[PDB]
Amino acid sequence: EVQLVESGGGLVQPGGSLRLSCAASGYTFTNYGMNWVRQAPGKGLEWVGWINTYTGEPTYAADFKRRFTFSLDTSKSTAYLQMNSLRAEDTAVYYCAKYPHYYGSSHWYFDVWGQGTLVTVSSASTKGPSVFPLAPSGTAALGCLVKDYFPEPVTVSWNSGALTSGVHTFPAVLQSSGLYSLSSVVTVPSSSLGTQTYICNVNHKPSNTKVDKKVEPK
Amino acid sequence: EVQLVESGGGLVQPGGSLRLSCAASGYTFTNYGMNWVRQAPGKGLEWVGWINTYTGEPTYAADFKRRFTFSLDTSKSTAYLQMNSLRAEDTAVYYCAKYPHYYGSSHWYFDVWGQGTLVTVSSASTKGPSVFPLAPSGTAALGCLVKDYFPEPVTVSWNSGALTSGVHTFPAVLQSSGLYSLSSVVTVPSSSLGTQTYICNVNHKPSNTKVDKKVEPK
Amino acid sequence: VVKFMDVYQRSYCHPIETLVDIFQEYPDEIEYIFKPSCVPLMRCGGCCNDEGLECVPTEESNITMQIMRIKPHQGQHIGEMSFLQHNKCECRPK
Amino acid sequence: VVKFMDVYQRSYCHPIETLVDIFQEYPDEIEYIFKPSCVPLMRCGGCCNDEGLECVPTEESNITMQIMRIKPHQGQHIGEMSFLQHNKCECRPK
Amino acid sequence: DIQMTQSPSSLSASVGDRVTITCSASQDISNYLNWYQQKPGKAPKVLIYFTSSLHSGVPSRFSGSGSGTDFTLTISSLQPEDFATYYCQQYSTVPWTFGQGTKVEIKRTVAAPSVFIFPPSDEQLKSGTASVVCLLNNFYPREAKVQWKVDNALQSGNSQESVTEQDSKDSTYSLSSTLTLSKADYEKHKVYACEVTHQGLSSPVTKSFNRGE
Amino acid sequence: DIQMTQSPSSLSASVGDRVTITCSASQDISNYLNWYQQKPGKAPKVLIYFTSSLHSGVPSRFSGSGSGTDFTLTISSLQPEDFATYYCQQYSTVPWTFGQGTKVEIKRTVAAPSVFIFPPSDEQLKSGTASVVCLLNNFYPREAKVQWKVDNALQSGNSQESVTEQDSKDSTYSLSSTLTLSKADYEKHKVYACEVTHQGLSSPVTKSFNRGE
DSSP states (O other): OOEEEEEOOEEEOTTOOEEEEEEEESSOGGGBOEEEEEEOTTSOOEEEEEEOTTTOOEEEOGGGTTTEEEEEEGGGTEEEEEEOSOOGGGOEEEEEEEOOOEESBOOOOOOEEOOOEEEEEOSSOOBOOEEEEEOOOOEEEEEEEEEEEBSSOOEEEEGGGTBOTTEEEOOOEEOTTSOEEEEEEEEEETTSTTTOOOEEEEEEGGGTEEEEEEOOOO | OOEEEEEOOEEEOTTOOEEEEEEEESSOGGGBOEEEEEEOTTSOOEEEEEEOTTTOOEEEOGGGTTTEEEEEETTTTEEEEEEOSOOGGGOEEEEEEEOOOEESBOOOOOOEEOOOEEEEEOSSOOBOOEEEEEOOOOEEEEEEEEEEEBSSOOEEEEGGGTOOSSEEEOOOEEOTTSOEEEEEEEEEESGGGGTOOEEEEEEBGGGTBOOEEEEOOO | OBOHHHHHHHHBSEEEEEEEEHHHHOTTOTTOEEESSEEEEEEEESBOSSTTEEEEEEEEEEEEEEEEEEETTTEEEEEEEEEEEEEEEEEEEO | OBOHHHHHHHHBSEEEEEEEEHHHHOTTOTTOEEESSEEEEEEEESBOSOTTEEEEEEEEEEEEEEEEEEETTTEEEEEEEEEEEEEEEEEEEO | OOOEEEEOSEEEEOTTOOEEEEEEESSOOTTOEEEEEEOTTSOOEEEEETTTEEOTTOOTTEEEEEETTEEEEEESSOOGGGOEEEEEEEOSSSSOEEOOOEEEEEOOOOBOOEEEEEOOOHHHHTTTEEEEEEEEEEEBSSOOEEEEEETTEEOOSSEEEEEOOOOTTTOOEEEEEEEEEEHHHHTTOOEEEEEEEOTTOSSOEEEEEETTO | OOOEEEEOSEEEEOTTOOEEEEEEESSOOTTOEEEEEEOTTSOOEEEEETTTEEOTTOOTTEEEEEETTEEEEEESSOOGGGOEEEEEEEOSSSSOEEOOOEEEEEOOOOBOOEEEEEOOOHHHHTTTEEEEEEEEEEEBSSOEEEEEEESSOBOOSSEEEEEOOOOTTTOOEEEEEEEEEEHHHHTTOOEEEEEEEETTOSSOEEEEEETTO
């Protein structure tokens, strides 16, 4: 299965550098060009440039020529994006996308994309979350409150991924303190409350905090 | 072994026709050209022409363009010579000879020749020879006398070919009577004359005579 | 030494693997760079051993191959391209 | 569909059988007719995929073959002729 | 840099409806245009390339037309799973550029929310703060009003809301409101309540709890 | 037609001798000349081609030189099996033409002849004839005098002598003599003799038989 996996995101201070990587698999890395696209929070899409995986030759959108550098390690089927002198406007989810296999003619659309990594440029400090239960008490609702972390993002799943239906994980909200907070909720049958176990799996990578919290009627 | 075998010679009347044939063996007939050369009795050599065995095209020495015709039958690996309006000056031994296998460059010399066939143009009739033994009596001489024959030649062997030693077949001398005759001698020891049998195998092809005479002391 | 019959049979008019230049086959792909720049196609080859004859195709077909195209500054990728082959050849008068 | 790797490997600079014309090889054999008029010789072919490199022979040798010569009105026969072959090729700077 | 201008910026339409999105290029780009679909939290996905060629695996209700400076994406019959933002991209001249996107929302029948209230946990209280949460689950339309009261004093300025993206199966929304208090203040009162007002509620709905019981 | 002139017509030499045969072309034939050897009763055999190339299976004692209009065949050391007639042949222009030949005769030690006299058979006799024979076996030189005698009367005008070709082993010749008479004229004499005279014979030898014995 053709897939692209990215890594290297997280908090970086203004003026700082970061190097993102895109690991390809399921096809011959050197047969298709690789593009880099970014999307600031709540905004549109912007092409950064692309690199020829057969010759190493890069092409940048003008605004990126000065502070960005594309490179590759074919012996690892990996493409890299090195960014220098970062400012707050550089904050965005960065994606890699390969060019397609053609038939007859060439069309430059992006066909397989990575999952995207968020890069946040801020002088603030990393801070892991505190996890609290939203205990239950037809249908009963329950969940967990993930409070005071920085930067984004936080990940939440239920029962190791076994429970996906009736689940709502709300968008993080920035508190007056400058720390985020969020709630993940799930509705279940009122009668499974004494027999079924519900665990919320929380992960905040920037600070390396993973927590499995069991939610039960108090 | 490469070999060329001719046939078709013999007595022909002036104004007559004859077709000589040349059978090739031991190599691929169509790979080498074929030449025809003649030699009048006691004289030199003369080139009649040659034929391309691949395409069938013949080339004649100018004196033969008008009465001679070269032809071939590749399915038989045979080359032919048709001679018309024969004169006495056409009496001769006719040979066929193939061109050779070259190395780098071409040289037009004849490498394998046939045994040759005598063609004798005369209005005189054929006549078989009469064999008369030459009874003998160290080393003793015996022989046979083949008189009265036309035209030439005649063949003389001894003891079916077992005795070739001491044998002296003499050239046919044209008798006053317009006929030919010769002698075939052989010298052996004095001892075997009473136990050893001596045979002379004569052979006048033109009249299909074949006289096998026994020579021994009277 | 190769024998006469063998050399004769090997050079007489037939479809032989020939390396053809892609851009010669598509003269309008001016702005592309191909890898490889030429492909292995069966085409007529050999001799007729006659000055008035010529070896010509009597049967043709197409073959599909994966060729990388590169448009400098724009894109790079492999994909399918079709080429003409000669399945049968024949010595015909010129 | 021939795979990219396969197409690339099959057309890269190497010794491929090429039918060469005998008279181009021996331009001083003006009066002869050869059967066959061309012979199958290993020669360098293929691509380098670089405009600054060229496929050239790094190892040569001779091959001997039985070819028929025909000089019209004079003679006809088969015999040995020597030809140049390329045993090894290489993409080297132009 | 060719500039792409998409229109409309956002639209709302019902299931079964035909939807058409426009794109205008700042200069002739011939037929060198692609269309992408992006869902919440995911990477864009290509639907159509070269003005009108459907990419493999894309439903036939998606089609593209146009040439020059004017192009159009059409969804012949809108489905609930079509909630997303659609983008156009030109590949006529580098740099490749996209339109600003069109957010397609699905219009459906009114659905009242199911309301739930949660007190702060004892683990949190130990830290010195108390967060009281109110959940409004699966409703439509998006507009709703949540009011907090503590011993009957209306709370103002000390709560924050967060709303979910439109569901791709049922087209509804969910919302959470969190009231923040000091442990000290939380322990001076008994009744905590959140009153909800929505188009599907004939009268406001109140959920509440008495601290300590 | 190019004309080849060969010389000498004939030559005599001893074993071990260095012999040369000449050829002259009526026009320049470059180096397109071949040499052949022909022994009694056989077909010619090529020795050298292209003026100087030794043919396979031919002894190195044979060599050729020349160019233009002058060519030379050389036998560095004459062997007894080299008795033959040699012919040159040009292949510059058709028709191919030969030189007229050179007969190489071997000169050796004087050998005396071995005489024998054969009487006419009774089978031939009944045929109305009679052919008396006398053979001079193996000798040298070629020269000899065979004089017949039928009852003291030396015969003349009724005899024919057939000479043999030089033997390629011992370089000897042989001679056959035939005195022909009629049956009746034969049976009127008795003493039939053939008188052999040779350089190898100090005194003329003679063989005879008594008619009726």
